[PDB]
Amino acid sequence: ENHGTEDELPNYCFPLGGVINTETLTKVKPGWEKDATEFSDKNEIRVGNNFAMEINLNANLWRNFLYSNIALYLPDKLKYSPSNVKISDNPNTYDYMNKRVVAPGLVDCYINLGARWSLDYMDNVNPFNHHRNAGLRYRSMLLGN
Amino acid sequence: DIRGVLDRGPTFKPYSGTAYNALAPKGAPNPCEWDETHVFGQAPYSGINITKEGIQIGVTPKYADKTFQPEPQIGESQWYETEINHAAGRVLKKTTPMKPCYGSYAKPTNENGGQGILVKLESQVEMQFFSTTELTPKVVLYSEDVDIETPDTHISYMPTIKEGNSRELMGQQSMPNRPNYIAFRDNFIGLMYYNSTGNMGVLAGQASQLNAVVDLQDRNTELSYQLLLDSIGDRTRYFSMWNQAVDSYDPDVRIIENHGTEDELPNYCFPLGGVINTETLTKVKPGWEKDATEFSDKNEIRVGNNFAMEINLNANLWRNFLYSNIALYLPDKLKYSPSNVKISDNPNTYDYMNKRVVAPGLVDCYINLGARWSLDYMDNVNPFNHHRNAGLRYRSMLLGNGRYVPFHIQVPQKFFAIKNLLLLPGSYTYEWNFRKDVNMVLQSSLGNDLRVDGASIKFDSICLYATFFPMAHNTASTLEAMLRNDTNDQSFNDYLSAANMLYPIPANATNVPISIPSRNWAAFRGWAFTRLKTKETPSLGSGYDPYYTYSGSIPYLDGTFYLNHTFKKVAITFDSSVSWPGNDRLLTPNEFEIKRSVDGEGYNVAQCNMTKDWFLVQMLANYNIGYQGFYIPESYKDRMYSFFRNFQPMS
Amino acid sequence: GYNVAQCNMTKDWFLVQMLANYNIGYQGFYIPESYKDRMYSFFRNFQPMSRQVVDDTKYKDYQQVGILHQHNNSGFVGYLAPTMREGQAYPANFPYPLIGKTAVDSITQKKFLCDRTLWRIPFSSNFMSMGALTDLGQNLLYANSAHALD
Amino acid sequence: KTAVDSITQKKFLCDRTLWRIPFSSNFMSMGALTDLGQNLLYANSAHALDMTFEVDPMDEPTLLYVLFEVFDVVRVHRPHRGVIETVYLRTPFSA
Amino acid sequence: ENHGTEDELPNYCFPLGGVINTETLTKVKPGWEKDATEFSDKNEIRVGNNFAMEINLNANLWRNFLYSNIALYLPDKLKYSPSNVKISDNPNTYDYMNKRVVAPGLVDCYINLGARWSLDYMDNVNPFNHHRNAGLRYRSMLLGN
Amino acid sequence: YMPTIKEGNSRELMGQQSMPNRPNYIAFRDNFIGLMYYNSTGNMGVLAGQ
């Protein structure tokens, strides 16, 4: 039910000390004259806003959910073998099904936006062979870890 | 109907995290000064010109009001820097406490929002000018002093002991105080005296003055009321008018289903302008030649990818959830006192229970990974004394969010002998007693002693309400006359209908024998037992307990038992010579074996250590299931307090 | 003295509503059966709430401040608009604390919400639902003559 | 591939409940007044009962809560106006 | 039911390579003497902790939820027109209701903290004219996107 | 946030910021309420023998 994400506000990261790029200024007094026997010549002053970077959160959470629960269960005909690594030739081996790489662009945060519509590839595969099967997960944890 | 005024004390804090400067980094300090004299600050505001009268904000020139300007929210608006030529800001004088920005609050002192301190009553802000190292000033700092407080946060790491604002004091960090809800107990348990001879409640005819209510020391009523309420209704709903909100807990915190996190993709954060480290290049044209009358010599071009850093989001969310809901509730023997800070010696004081520090490594995002397994330390502590108890949280929010709450509540009658009595015309004397100990009538989410934390309560007015059915007089006379026949006497029975015996168990003891002297056993119905902590149980029938210093949930009253999983064997015999039930009914023909170790795996069941015979007995006792194959009972037959509902196998 | 359910609803009105919907109240209030209180019933959508606010009359140091001057998370949140962050770090000046050692004197406000429902006033002697054709409807007083209602 | 040899641990949790041991021949709930309670063996004479529990220990004093559920019945009679009298009976363990 | 957020631990962000600002040092051996025919003079060593900043996550998620679901549905008397942009005069058009700006400070992560209390303004606005109305959302996706 | 009102690509125009438009679902009413005329004398529905 891809109804998008709520990302009206921007979220930021700020340095541990708050400011990291500050200049050193000297104190002067009234025509203006220098000062001594007071505040030292080494004063950490930051002009303007503090340095910070921004990351969208709801969009990132949506992307992680989609890739981990759908994009990894596409039919093998859509995936492709990786490069410079070994991979088992038998398609039923766990090694084969684990090392096949899927382009995230196939299913992203904008696929069929605003529509309640399962994928045209996902409907011909077993949905119960999924790691979110609560019954299967519960039975597995019953034996142990 | 009771009306009064309540004071919940300074311990009350009905929310996690803080309220002031929540988004701030936990180590970021407010701009301030100190002596060794050095100043550390930041001026965001931009003006036009700087003179001896301060920054000029507009027009003849106008200068900022030192009382409240420059405001600390106004700053720039474009991400790219523009080489501000005249800046202003605010700093704190050296005569103020040195605190981090996170959680720091200072009350205002004027309608414009200023926070300066007024003395004889005018403020005393000062002007400070700073210029580059080689003549006009460049920035102006508005130094002042405020009554800065930390209402809900405490220092988590104090670098040194020496008091006073010094350079080393910049490194302190703070984290919010633990949440602690305080409210009335479920169904107003404890406000009404029960099963106490000294505080006997009386209901008698006006003329006879002979008490019609006689209670017993061993009889339990509030627990009986709780069980009765569950059987005849549903407890998952909330009724505010009776303060009806059953205590519970999140199934996740009690039993962690740690199946890891989904973090296949990397999540990144990017600079505000997209690129920050870019070089300047000139434009050339075809052998190549320079160009003029065109694109300037200064062009911002960035080669390669843009600067960025990454976060594992799901892992971080998992860590925060675990530490805040589990690691803070470990037994105190695992924690350790912090350093360079004061802490109350009393283990029951909220200050002590708040300042003890827990290493996050004890419970991290990798503990028992892939297994549905509760911790070996969490299972011996009360799970209902947790800030996620929805019933407790709902009741706390009913009163309000302040510490001084005038309340007005309604209390029902719980004694089984009169709670359904149908009276007849006449005059009767109705008299009862009510408690005042805050440790009993109130309930906290941490169980800290409230007698020492200053919580108080005072009742002003008490009134009794009763509603009569507007029913016809003629048939009322017939009904009351017909009810005055000895053959039609009303009768009631207690729902629990049990005699309660408490037997001490010494610490670290394993075997506890009890004995009952010879007596008639006609009409006996059976046993029902559990285990309680003497720390969490008040004395029976005492008017006031001077040694009861626990304000958490009381399993003996509200029926929230959590120690049933600590039984191994039960042996029952009459006359000390004939065993019961005998007749080799069970696999062990002498005793009930609740659970065994791996040695007796041949008798385990349900993929646990609980033996088959005990499991069969419990199923038969609750739903009469087992003689024709086990299966899940009907949902309407296993209520909230039933056995099969709360049975959880783990490995 | 006449409120109920820890809100500002009067006792008599609350009793009438319970009687009108589920005939509950003459033998003690309790949770009605789930099948009896449907999605539009009164009790399903009854929500009593309360809160405390700073007593501007008793607090000696009260200073009413406007929206244009409250600074919380200053230097980390845009000013009066969902835009880029600006400003500088500074101790907050809003809202007034209501807990802890330095809590201020406060008053209380109580109110309630009730959606997807209609206030019902049955035309019966005891406000009970003993049939579609109520007893007062069959009373001869209104059966013969006419009356003007305001 | 590099997993290490391991042992297993099993346990269980049971909250908000009491261990129940009915005093009936087949542990069935066939009525409030159980058959064994009506047996003549316990109806005529008296018996001294002792019973031992074996529990795993912890490091703080604890209490063993035992409930001998019995019949607790009160009958209320009033002959005239404004006079109320009651009778109590808790059998066994009567005061 | 504003019961605050759980933010006891700080959540950080780290550079892609782990370290960015490292020095170049030479290897010496025992008095001490320089070395050759071994580790080159160009060695990337970082002293002290790695550079990183941090984010409060639960607080940010709470703010986004509040602004997107409440602050945008305040009565128009509390909002104010933006600047330097064109906005339709008719108060019923989508353009008008989309371009009015609301100061986030009206409803922030600290409004009525710890109290289960609806706002004094939302009690007079229709709660069913909300984008989280499941019935309305379901019927919309039924037609299509 | 528009920095300046003057049109044309200028340096000051770097600083504009965007936020998504408010969501607005449009669909038929529940149970197709309002599609058929009810309780209107002018648009009276009729069902009669032939």
Author numbering:
A (entry chain B): 1401 to 1430, 1437 to 1551
B (entry chain C): 2101 to 2136, 2165 to 2187, 2191 to 2251, 2257 to 2270, 2279 to 2430, 2437 to 2801
C (entry chain A): 752 to 901
D (entry chain C): 2852 to 2946
E (entry chain A): 401 to 430, 437 to 551
F (entry chain A): 301 to 350
Lines from the paper:
Hexon is a trimeric, barrel-shaped protein that represents the main building block of the virus capsid. Adenoviruses are non-enveloped viruses with a capsid of icosahedral symmetry that encapsulates a double-stranded DNA genome. In this model, human lactoferrin (hLF), an innate immune protein, aids the viral uptake into epithelial cells by mediating interactions between the major capsid protein, hexon, and yet unknown host cellular receptor(s). Here, we present a new cryo-EM structure of HAdV-5C hexon at high resolution alongside a hybrid structure of HAdV-5C hexon complexed with human lactoferrin (hLF).
